[PDB]
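Form 12-C: Joint structure prediction
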Amino acid sequence: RIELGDVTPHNIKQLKRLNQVIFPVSYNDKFYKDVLEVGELAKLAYFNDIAVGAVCCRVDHSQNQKRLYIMTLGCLAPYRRLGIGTKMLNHVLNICEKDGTFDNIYLHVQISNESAIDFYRKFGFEIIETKKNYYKRIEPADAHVLQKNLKVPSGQNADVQKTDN
Amino acid sequence: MLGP
Ligand SMILES: *SCCNC(=O)CCNC(=O)[C@H](O)C(C)(C)C
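Section 2 - Result
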């Protein structure tokens, strides 16, 4: 069984320890300070009561839009075929679906991370941008921006709803 | 994975 748990000051050191092993990118103290303030947008992932993963998100107001930014999402390498990634993603997509007012969900990923690209493609995410030297020192340093459109038409019925045509 |  997979369980998601809250990120508190009691277990933030555990999230940092998992993040430090899963990702080659060093996150600073301000990153872990912000995670303690996003509520349900940050979760620890548990498999048979053992912490093997985490998802950290924030609300972003870039591009004159209401966006959900997935900062980090991942599991320890031996636990990537246990549906923990799906549980974590369906959790953040639920916070968004319930909200109804988000324009999109987006994240950065190295261009060579095919397992993550293909995973996100299952939930409707597409490559919308490629950023040269988005990361420092790691190879490849080039990142794809993966985005899922969350915009739902506002209007009580068909005649007042603006959508694709 | 937030960068850089
Ligand atoms: S947020 C996209 C980058 N994640 C990543 O590379 C973390 C390691 N990968 C996983 O744990 C796994 O591939 C999932 C599907 C959960 C991203």
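Section 3 - Comments
The interface with chain A takes residues 1-4 of chain B (CB under 8 Å). DSSP finds no helices and no strands in chain B.
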